[PDB]
Design a protein around this nucleic acid. Structure first.
Lengths: 138, 275, 356
RNA sequence: AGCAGAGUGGCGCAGCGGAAGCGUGCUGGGCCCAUAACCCAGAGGUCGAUGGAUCGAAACCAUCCUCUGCUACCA
C-alpha cells in the first residue's frame, strides 16, 4: 500500500498553496439590515450584493424566499425588497444559511463556482471544480 | 353611418339587450342603447337589484357595458325603460353571444361599405336592408340565424348569388367576407396503438400497417406518423367533421377486423376528436 | 487502429451510495447510464446500466442505494467481472460492498480489483485509516487478494496506468461454447451478452420464459429477430461480455416498461424447459448480511438472468426446497443460483446453490 | 414526440375578436368616542420576435423562439 501512500501524495492536483477545506462553508455572513415598520414590512438590503455576488442569478432567489412561510411580496428593487409580514434577523439569515446549505452549495465541494444550469426538465446544478449533477427539487 | 343592428327600430318588450351607460343621477341612470342605434334610455334607481344595496358605484359604473331587460317600452314618447333585477346570468351569456355576433356582422358590413367608398348613409341603411336584414328574415331571427347565413356564405357562395349587388360590390363583399371568418383548419386526430400479435406478430402488425396505409380516403387523407414503433397518430385534415370521424373509426375498424383473424387485441389510447 | 468487434467484457461498478460509482463508470465508457427521469433527479441508479467503449469494453453501473440492491445482484449473476471503487467519503463505505463481495464469493468471481477513487478530495489520514480498514474488511472474504490503485476517474488523472493495470490483472475470460445457446435480455431494445452459440438477424429465435397468459400457464415463445445490435451499434457477431442489443418479433408496446425483462433468449429450435417447480441444493449464511430456520410456504427470491421470482415451499429440508412460482421461469438446464429472502421489506441474500 | 396556460400598466388569476378588466393584496382617507365591519380614491407606459387587411391589436387570427404544469420508453 505504501506505493499507493506515495500515490496519494503524488497523484494529487498540482501542488498550489491552498490546502484542505474541511467544512469550508463560506461565512460571508451578510444578513439583511432589515428595517421593519413593526406591522407588515421587511426590507431586504444587501440583496443585489448576494443576488449578483453569489452564483445564483436574479429571480431565482425570489421564488425560494417566497416559498418559506408562503409569504407574499415581490420586487421593489432587489435592494430594499418588500416581503409580506414581519421576520426576525437571525431567522431570515438562517434561511439564507439553508439556501446556501442545500441549493447553491453541496458538500461534495463547498466552492463558489456552482454556476447555474437547467437540463431537459428539471433545474440541475454543477460545479466547475467537479461538474456534478446537483439536480435540486426538494 | 351607424344605425339599427336589425330591421326593427325600437326594441321589443321583455328582451335582453347589451347597453352602455352615459350618466348617473338621483332619480335613475341614463343609458345608451348600443344594440339599437345608440338611442338613449333610462334605468330607474329602484330598478337595479333586489338586494339591500350599499354601493351604486359597484353595480353600474360610468363606461362599462352590461345586460339589461327591457321593461316598459312606449312609442308616442319613446321612453325606453330597462332594469337589471329580472336578469338571470344565463340570459346574460346569451345576450353577450348575440351582441358579439351582431358586432361581427356590423364590423364586416362597415368594412365592405367603407372599402366601397360608400359614404352615402341612407344607402348604408339600404345596404343593410338589401343583405343583412333580409338574411335575418331568411332564418327568421337576428343573430344566430344570421350566423347560420354567413356560415354558409364564407363557405358556399350560392346564397350570396341571391343578392342584388353590382359587379364591384361582390368583389369587396368577398374580399372582406372570407378572410375574417375561416381560420378553421380542423384536423381530426386520434393517437392509437394496435397491440395485435401471434407467432408471426411481425407480419400481424405489418399487415395492420398495410391496411392503415391503403385505407386512405382521398379528399380526407388518413395519414400515419410514427414516433415509437407501436405508436402512431391517425390524422385526417378534412374540414367537415361528420365525414372525417366516421371514416376514421371505419378505417380503424377494418384494420382491427382483418387483424382480428390473427389474435388482435387493442391498446386503446385516444378517441375521435376534432381540434 | 482498433478493431470494431463485439464487447468481450462487462465490468461492474460497486460501492456505497453517492460515492461516485456512476461517474467512474461514465468516465471509463463515455456513455450515460441514467435512463429514468426519477433516477436523474434522485441521483441514484434505478435500473441496471450499460455503456460501451473500445479497449471493446463495457461498464456495469450498479446502484449504491440499499433498497435497489436486488436488481444489481440479479445483473451481477449475468456479469463477467466487477470493479470496486472505494471513495474518500468513508472508511466503512456502507455494508453493501461487503454483501456484494460475499455474493461474488458464492458465485466464484475471485478476480477482483479495488479502486481508490476521489483521493484528491480526502485527507491522507483518511487514506491510512482506509488502508487499515481495507486490510481488516477484505481479510476472510473473496476481496482479500484485490489490489488498490488510487485514481480520480472524474478528473481523468492516471487513467493510462489504470487501463494497463486493469487489462493486465483482470483478464476477459473465454466462453463455454459447447452448452445450448443463450442470450440474456435485461430490458424491454434488449441488452445483454451472448454466452454461447450464435444468432443472426432474420433468424427465428425464442424467449424461453415467454409469457404468463391472462390454470393459466406459459408455453415458451418462439419468435424472430428483426435486427441484431451490440449496445446501440449493429454487428455481425456477439460474444460474452458487454451489453449487446437483441431485437425480437414482439410488439414493443407489449415489451414496454421492462415487461420482457429477466427472461433468457435462445434459438427457436432450442429446447428450453419452462418449469413452475425446481430443485436446488443449497447452504445458508451465518449472519444477516443486509443490515448496516427456513419453513414451508415462504417466498424466497431466486435470481436467474435479470429476473427475481418467488415461490412457495411445500416442504423444507436442510439443503433442498421446492417452489411453485406465480409466473413461470424457464429453466433450460442446470446452472448457478444465489438465494435471497425478503425480510423487513427488503430482499436479503440467505444462501446460494445449484439446480440439479 | 403528446395537453393546457404565458410572454404584466401596482402583488395574484389573465378580463376576451377595441390595453391593467376584475377578485385579492398594498399605500392612503371617510364612518365610529374607539376597534372590527362596511364605504371610497391611487400607482415612471411596442405588455417575445415576425406576416395580412382593419377603426382595430398586450389583450384580433395564423406563424418561430423560450417557460411552466402534465408525457413515455428506451438508450
Amino acid at each position: 500500500y505504501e506505493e499507493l501512500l506515495n500515490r496519494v501524495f503524488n497523484i494529487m492536483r498540482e501542488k498550489n498553496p491552498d490546502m484542505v477545506a474541511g467544512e469550508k462553508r463560506k461565512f460571508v455572513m451578510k444578513p439583511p439590515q432589515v428595517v421593519r415598520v413593526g406591522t407588515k414590512k421587511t426590507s431586504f438590503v444587501n440583496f443585489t450584493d448576494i443576488c449578483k455576488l453569489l452564483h445564483r442569478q436574479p429571480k431565482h432567489l425570489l421564488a425560494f424566499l417566497l416559498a418559506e412561510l408562503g409569504t407574499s411580496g415581490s420586487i421593489d428593487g432587489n435592494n430594499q425588497l418588500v416581503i409580506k409580514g414581519r421576520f426576525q434577523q437571525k431567522q431570515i439569515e438562517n434561511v439564507l444559511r439553508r439556501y446556501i446549505k442545500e441549493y447553491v452549495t453541496c458538500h461534495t465541494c463547498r466552492s463558489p463556482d456552482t454556476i447555474l444550469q437547467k437540463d431537459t426538465r428539471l433545474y440541475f446544478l454543477q460545479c466547475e471544480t467537479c461538474h456534478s449533477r446537483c439536480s435540486v427539487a426538494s | 353611418l351607424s344605425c339599427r343592428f336589425y330591421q326593427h327600430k325600437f326594441p321589443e318588450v321583455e328582451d335582453v339587450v347589451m347597453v352602455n351607460v352615459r350618466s348617473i343621477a338621483e332619480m335613475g341612470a341614463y343609458v345608451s342603447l348600443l344594440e339599437y342605434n345608440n338611442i338613449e334610455g333610462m334605468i330607474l334607481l329602484s330598478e337595479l337589484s333586489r338586494r339591500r344595496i350599499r354601493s351604486i358605484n359597484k353595480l353600474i359604473r360610468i363606461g362599462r357595458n352590461e345586460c339589461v331587460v327591457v321593461i316598459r317600452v312606449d312609442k308616442e314618447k319613446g321612453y325606453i325603460d330597462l332594469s337589471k333585477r329580472r336578469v338571470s346570468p344565463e340570459e346574460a351569456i346569451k345576450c353577450e353571444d348575440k351582441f358579439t355576433k351582431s358586432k361581427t356582422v356590423y364590423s364586416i358590413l362597415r368594412h365592405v361599405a367603407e372599402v366601397l367608398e360608400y359614404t352615402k348613409d341612407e344607402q348604408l341603411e339600404s345596404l343593410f336592408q338589401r343583405t343583412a336584414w333580409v338574411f335575418d328574415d331568411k332564418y327568421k331571427r337576428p343573430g344566430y340565424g344570421a350566423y347560420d347565413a354567413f356560415k354558409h356564405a364564407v363557405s358556399d357562395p350560392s346564397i350570396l348569388d341571391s343578392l342584388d349587388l353590382n359587379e364591384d360590390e361582390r368583389e369587396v363583399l368577398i374580399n372582406n367576407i372570407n378572410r375574417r371568418l375561416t381560420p378553421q383548419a380542423v384536423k381530426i386526430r386520434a393517437d392509437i396503438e394496435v397491440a395485435c400479435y401471434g407467432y408471426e406478430g411481425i407480419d400481424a402488425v405489418k399487415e395492420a400497417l398495410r391496411a392503415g396505409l391503403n385505407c386512405s380516403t382521398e379528399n380526407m387523407p388518413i395519414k400515419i406518423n410514427l414516433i415509437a414503433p407501436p405508436r402512431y397518430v391517425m390524422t385526417t385534415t378534412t374540414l367537415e367533421r361528420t365525414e372525417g370521424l366516421s371514416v376514421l373509426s371505419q378505417a380503424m375498424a377494418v384494420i382491427k377486423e382483418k387483424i382480428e383473424e390473427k389474435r388482435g387485441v387493442f391498446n386503446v389510447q385516444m378517441e375521435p376528436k376534432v381540434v | 487502429e482498433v478493431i470494431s468487434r463485439q464487447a468481450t467484457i462487462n465490468i461492474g461498478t460497486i460501492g456505497h451510495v453517492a460515492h461516485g460509482k456512476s461517474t467512474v463508470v461514465k468516465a471509463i465508457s463515455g456513455v450515460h447510464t441514467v435512463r429514468f427521469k426519477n433516477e436523474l433527479e434522485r441521483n441514484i441508479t434505478i435500473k441496471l446500466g450499460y455503456a460501451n467503449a473500445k479497449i471493446h469494453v463495457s461498464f456495469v453501473d450498479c446502484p449504491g442505494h440499499d433498497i435497489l440492491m436486488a436488481t444489481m445482484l440479479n445483473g451481477a449473476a449475468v456479469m463477467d467481472a466487477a470493479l470496486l471503487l472505494i471513495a474518500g467519503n468513508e472508511s466503512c463505505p456502507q455494508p453493501q460492498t461487503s454483501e456484494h463481495l460475499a455474493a461474488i464469493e458464492i458465485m466464484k468471481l475471485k478476480h477482483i480489483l479495488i479502486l481508490q477513487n476521489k483521493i484528491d478530495l480526502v485527507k491522507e489520514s483518511q487514506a491510512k485509516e482506509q488502508y487499515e480498514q481495507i486490510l481488516a474488511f477484505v481479510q476472510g472474504t473473496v476481496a482479500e487478494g484485490a489490489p488498490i490503485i488510487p485514481i480520480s476517474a472524474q478528473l481523468k488523472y492516471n487513467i493510462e496506468v489504470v487501463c494497463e493495470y486493469i487489462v493486465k490483472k483482470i483478464p476477459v475470460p473465454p466462453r463455454d461454447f459447447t452448452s445450448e445457446p443463450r442470450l440474456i435480455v435485461i430490458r424491454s431494445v434488449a441488452g445483454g451478452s451472448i454466452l454461447k452459440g450464435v444468432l443472426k438477424v432474420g433468424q427465428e429465435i425464442e424467449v424461453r420464459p415467454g409469457i404468463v397468459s391472462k390454470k393459466l400457464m406459459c408455453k415458451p415463445i418462439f419468435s424472430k429477430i428483426v435486427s441484431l445490435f451490440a449496445e446501440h451499434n449493429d454487428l455481425q457477431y456477439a460474444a460474452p461480455g458487454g451489453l449487446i442489443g437483441v431485437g425480437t418479433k414482439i410488439d414493443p408496446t407489449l415489451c414496454r416498461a421492462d415487461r420482457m425483462v429477466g427472461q433468457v433468449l435462445g434459438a427457436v429450435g432450442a429446447l428450453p424447459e419452462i418449469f413452475t417447480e425446481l430443485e436446488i441444493s443449497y447452504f445458508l449464511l451465518r449472519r444477516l448480511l443486509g443490515v448496516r430456520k427456513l419453513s414451508k410456504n415462504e417466498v424466497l427470491m431466486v435470481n436467474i438472468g435479470s429476473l427475481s421470482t418467488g415461490g412457495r415451499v411445500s416442504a423444507v429440508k436442510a439443503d433442498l426446497g421446492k417452489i411453485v412460482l406465480t409466473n413461470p421461469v424457464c429453466t433450460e438446464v442446470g446452472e448457478k443460483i444465489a438465494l435471497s429472502r425478503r425480510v423487513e421489506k427488503h430482499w436479503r441474500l440467505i444462501g446460494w446453490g445449484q439446480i440439479r
